[PDB]
């Protein structure tokens, strides 16, 4: 009985929930492309906590949703491919949350998988949590992975240059929270 509502309406309700200033949710700017395609969001991601290595960076992204939401997952990709250990040239991600587990799901028992009960905020929380704490059990064959593993100064230097490039795309658009 979970998600009796339409697909179009469900994305609209979660769009209004996450765009409400009064709600004020953990920093995520999201708006629909051409304010007309509901099923394609443009999402700017900022890092909350200073302890993580990506703090103070504005990385734009697109989330494309399928027709049968929410018993399929959406696709996520960064509008500029970034220097991350889990980001390919494409901009697509190695995340366990955006893929289905298969067969009788029954309990979805131990961790991190796509379900109908799963929400968009949940996807955005896990993109941030994987960004601030990268996951090396599923690395991507990008230079960023090899640099994180050997741990030279180049890793944090290319993180900083990318955070500076991200800061390059914030002034356009008055209200900067």
């Amino acid at each position: 009985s979970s998600r009796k509502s339409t697909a179009s309406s469900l994305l609209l309700r979660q769009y209004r929930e996450l765009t409400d200033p009064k709600k004020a949710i953990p920093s995520f700017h999201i708006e629909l492309e051409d304010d007309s395609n509901i099923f394609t969001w443009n999402i700017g991601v900022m890092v909350l906590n200073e302890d993580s290595i990506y703090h103070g960076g504005f990385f734009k992204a697109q989330m494309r949703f399928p027709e049968d939401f929410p018993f399929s997952p959406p696709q996520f990709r960064f509008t500029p491919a970034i220097y991350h250990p889990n980001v390919y040239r494409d901009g697509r991600l190695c995340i366990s949350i955006l893929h289905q587990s298969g067969d009788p799901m029954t309990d979805e028992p131990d961790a991190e998988t796509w379900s109908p009960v799963q929400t968009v905020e949940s996807v955005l929380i896990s993109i941030v949590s994987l960004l601030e704490d990268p996951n090396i059990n599923s690395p991507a064959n990008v230079d960023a992975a090899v640099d994180y593993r050997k741990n030279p100064e180049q890793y944090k230097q290319r993180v900083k240059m990318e955070v500076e490039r991200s800061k390059q795309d914030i002034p356009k658009g008055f209200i900067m929270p």
Binding site: Y88, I95, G102, S138
Partner: peptide, 16 residues
């Protein structure tokens, strides 16, 4: 009462 299409294969398992 529709069925959920086959699970997409994670990109890390596909590519590497």
């Amino acid at each position: 009462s529709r069925d959920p299409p086959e699970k997409s294969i994670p990109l890390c398992t596909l590519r590497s």
